[model samples]
Target: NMQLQLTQEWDKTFPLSAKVEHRKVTFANRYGITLAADLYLPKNRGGDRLPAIVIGGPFGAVKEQSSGLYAQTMAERGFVTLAFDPSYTGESGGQPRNVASPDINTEDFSAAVDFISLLPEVNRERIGVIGICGWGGMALNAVAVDKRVKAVVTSTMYDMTRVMSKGYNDSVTLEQRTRTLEQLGQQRWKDAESGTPAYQPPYNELKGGEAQFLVDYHDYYMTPRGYHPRAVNSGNAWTMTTPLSFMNMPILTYIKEISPRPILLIHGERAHSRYFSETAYAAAAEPKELLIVPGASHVDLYDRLDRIPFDRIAGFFDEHL
Candidate 1:
């Protein structure tokens, strides 16, 4: 019910599609944070109600990036879809801009469901969700907790908490974790004293030498391919101490609870984050599928239509939802 100042023009990184109807909408989470979303619906549809899908993520990304692209595509395939910004980012309304929380972000998905369920054009009982990158992890956590979500899909999943706390492939040592905690603790004191949160430099900023994965990130976020001014991945970093919450509260501890409902996890075989999907698939219960896209990397799944396997995703939702 909260109000948001939404963008009136078409500003997404991808071109707007003629096959679907798109509009900006706003809804609030239980915490009272207002979220902005782009809603996409199939043009000239026959029914009064249609199955709906809520989409989000790539972590620090806004609705104008991968989430919007996914929503629009799925709408073209006949589902009403919503792509929303998480609390405290992009066009969403929250204090302390650019902050993150596993709990609230996961709640954002449920909030989308709340909004979609109330719509006269939507089939409330057939709601589904898709989370990409870090949001994929959030989506898993969401389905674990929100029974209203009947089906879930994740693309190029990244377990944000695991990667933040244990490092990629669980490589961070206990001592290293302690040091990170210590640093965050010190940062908290600095913020309290300054009466303002401290921010880290943009994650997409290149310092000459970087890993190939980071380079891939830069290509999507820092360049025109996926850049959007409001996106954190494009030029801003999360609050300096944002990792504090993710480090301690892993989101997928109860993923098995999501069973009895269908889950489809898609990732690029060559993606650096492919192991996240493999790990999640191992932990998740049956009525699940793990799809590996040959030759595609992590970021490729973000916006590369050819690499995203939309046909499979559409079919999965059609069958399950």
Candidate 2:
């Protein structure tokens, strides 16, 4: 019941990189949800095949933020890259907006693999992926199940299902978990009665007594630094009932299966979410490496080029891809 009307304007939060060519692109997921993406090409390419990577997410953040920066930067380094808005968010076409499903979102990555592999500019055997924040877990899940991706990386990683189901730092008790689920179940009745769904209050609001990481979120998303009107993190929240599916499906359950293929997990040493990458690295098999940046908070990895270690990232892909 919707259509994609992509804005061709140069409206990204970051300035356009001079080393690459950028264009708007679209490709459909298996569910027929047409995802919108910013495609990055090395301006110097001829007909030669190039290593390609698909980048997505920091959960609700759009491609115009972290993904776009990552894509353009990679393209500058010689690989073809794509940064896309996940289905139902940003300019991607999916009904009942702000829907977040582990299955469908994981499919988004594999579908991007489908699109990138077919391009004449890409060396099909050198396909790779980089997922930020929640999509970090999605990228890991996708690589585990879809054997096509040759290598993977995750920055400031978050296991969305882990954080959603168990609560931060695994603090939710059985009673609390049961009560929350009961409320979500009851909300389903409200939706059925009203014939519509409801979203949570707009995201990134500060009421004076929030935590450091939360304040960090506000600094980027609420400020001009990372704000985008279409981004969920900028001024929107997921549907209140969106956590139901993730609670039941742990996206990182099969992480060990991505073996043989290399994995590079990057996280800020000072980040509250650093443990997500640490635990992921511990669970993954051989040929895995974890790099922790000193003095960086979670959001630092989202932008902050001085701390992001892009040269190391490009070098990782250089050897692995």
Candidate 3:
């Protein structure tokens, strides 16, 4: 049995939409980590099973942020949708809080499929998924391995592993990589000795002279528009050694295998992470499309309803799923 303690009240960054019926739900991943999600059902639905979409992430963000907004919007458009927290974040049950695993995080999407497939109100054969920002790559990885997912959509995607290991735009060198590994290796010893994991820098901490993309992130995660207490990006940080797994295991190795299943990759044309989507699109086979939202930045797609291409996303799933 799972022992998760979920928030009972409505505490999402976005207001609950009147067009959908919302509820809190929990399901476990293969790793036995229980995940918390907000399940959105379209109001006044007929008795027939409905198509469903599972949505998650901007990497360290909780479900209450962009994921919830996406889910509610999709639900309002006549599909049942769920926005969930990945394992070890938000209200999810896991040990050594704020840690991340590439394998486990990818499985969280498939685990969501497991939950939605079993729901009597959901059409198991018509299930789809959307991954935003960093989780966008994880969504692609999930579709590659899980045949149950019929379609996928990614917005403002980031290849987390690539950025962590090689730095943005593949800038990290052999020497830098070696140095990082050495530091992480030593940090593990300190964690073992202290019996607690060391944390990386807090997300909102600005040490002066940061990049513009990071400033954009601060506008979303640290401001009223997207801030949430449980979100890692909003105020918390991952464990110091959390990047160890991501650095070694790249998530998109088998992305081409997901071909024959439709994928819609959406990214802001001006987003700092646009290259990640372009590279994934290049690596993927046919039945894939790259949609660039002109003049929009990375964080603009996070919670800016005016900028997020929800119509295109909903239309893709409606036609494909």
Candidate 4:
């Protein structure tokens, strides 16, 4: 099993709150990839049972970023919240870092379920998940496969594989997709010869004439507002062929499995990714909801306190779990 070296210092972009006590936890995934998490706990009396929630996301940001913020906020509302770094990224243990995929990343959520279910204070039957950005859809996929999770929520969700294979809003034509795939096929030779994978230029640092979404991403990941040096989305880069991993595989195709168990899809009304949350909501069975936050953009759902609906998220757990 792989072991990870997680930082102990409070290096989060958002300052620590008095609401919860934070601790570092190490766990393992199906691939034996060791995971590092920030578990946020509320002061309590009895340890017999209490609802637990696991979280991650913004695709490549570390646990010290949005993930922990959500966990800490939820903990303040009386929950056992744990925010973990996905394998191959953040402080988790994985070789040739910065690689991620549909299956591997989705399995990371179930792995959290395994760890949280083992905790004595947790009522394993009450476990829930909240995935942000790319992990939002990942959570849905995980919920479809795991029976222990009673409720699931996704904020600013995205279908990673769909976006990679077909481009945003499915603008990618068949030939364009094949061309990208072919290029990726050629890139592996260089990686194989060098004995090391290549990385794209640092994320969120874009030139002019880019999409406004790029500027929005830069405002968060590139600026102090959301930057964390260790985060793959901040100062680091993802593997050059990272998209190749998600290219052929599709996820969330079985969201109906999570239908009887409540699924909450939240998105900023103005977010470019709103389509995804809506699409997911449509595919999910009964007992699902799509909440659109007015005038809110994608990243607004990440760390904007006023924009995030804490009560609703907790309410989903309270009633469903």
Tens digits of lDDT, candidate 3, 120-148: 89999999999999999999999998999
- Measured with C-alpha atoms, the lDDT of residue 269 in candidate 4 is 87
Ranked by lDDT from best down, the candidates are 1, 3, 2, 4
Tens-digit lDDT track for model 2 on 1-321?
246799989999888988888888888988888998999989878777999999998999999998998899889999999999999899999868998999999999998888888888899999999999999999999999999899999999999998988888999888989999999999999988998889989999999899999999999999999999999899898888999999989887888889988999999999999999998999999889999999999999999999898998999898888
Q: Between which residue pairs do clashes occur in model 2?
A: none
Tell me how far candidate 2 lies from the true structure as C-alpha RMSD in angstroms.
Answer: 1.3
> Residue 56, candidate 1: how far off, in angstroms?
0.6
Q: What's the distance in Å from true for residue 207, model 4?
A: 1.0
Residue 307 Cα positional deviation in candidate 4, in Å, after optimal superposition: 0.5
Model 3: lDDT equals 0.92
Q: Which stretches of candidate 1 lie above 4 Å from their native place?
A: none
Worst 10 residues of 2 by lDDT: 1-10
Q: What's the TM for model 2?
A: 0.98
122 in model 4: Cα distance from truth in Å? 1.0
Decoy 3 TM-score against native: 0.98
Residue range 161-192, candidate 1, lDDT tens digits? 99999998898999999999999999999999
Model 1 is weakest, by summed lDDT over 10 consecutive residues, at: 40-49
Instruction: Give per-residue CA lDDT, model 4, range 52-162, as digits (tens).
Output: 999989788888889989999998888898999888888888988999889999999999889988887778888999999999989999999898899998999998888
What lDDT, from 0 to 1, does candidate 4 have? 0.88
Sliding window of 10 residues with minimal summed lDDT for model 3: 1-10
